[PDB]
Design a protein. Structure first.
Length: 102
């Protein structure tokens, strides 16, 4: 199913976020109100929140916060692959910017 808020908290504490920062993330998750499919790959937190008004995506790791809205399946898939490739959130964002430039 979907990852619970308590499990997300623990995962983000591993990623390197404080409970206050996590609270902000939880607010973001509630803001969208979609299906919070949160994955933990190699320490990197891949938050995929599916919604009919547009899939939202949030990358969290080592204090880095990448908030994206209106993400396509191809973009989300690419991000997931980059994470599994061992790419950092900053490097992923650089790739996303290259995508957005197109």
């Amino acid at each position: 199913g979907l990852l619970t808020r308590e499990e997300i908290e623990a995962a983000l504490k591993e990623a390197g976020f404080t409970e206050e920062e996590i609270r902000k993330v939880l607010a973001w998750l509630e803001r969208v109100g979609g299906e919070r499919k949160v994955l933990k790959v190699a320490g990197k937190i891949l938050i995929i929140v599916e919604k009919r008004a547009g899939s939202r995506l949030l990358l969290l790791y080592a204090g880095r916060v990448i908030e994206k809205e209106g993400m396509s399946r191809e973009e989300v898939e690419a991000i997931k692959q980059l994470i599994s490739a061992g790419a950092t959130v900053e490097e992923i964002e650089a790739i996303i910017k290259r995508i957005e430039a197109r």
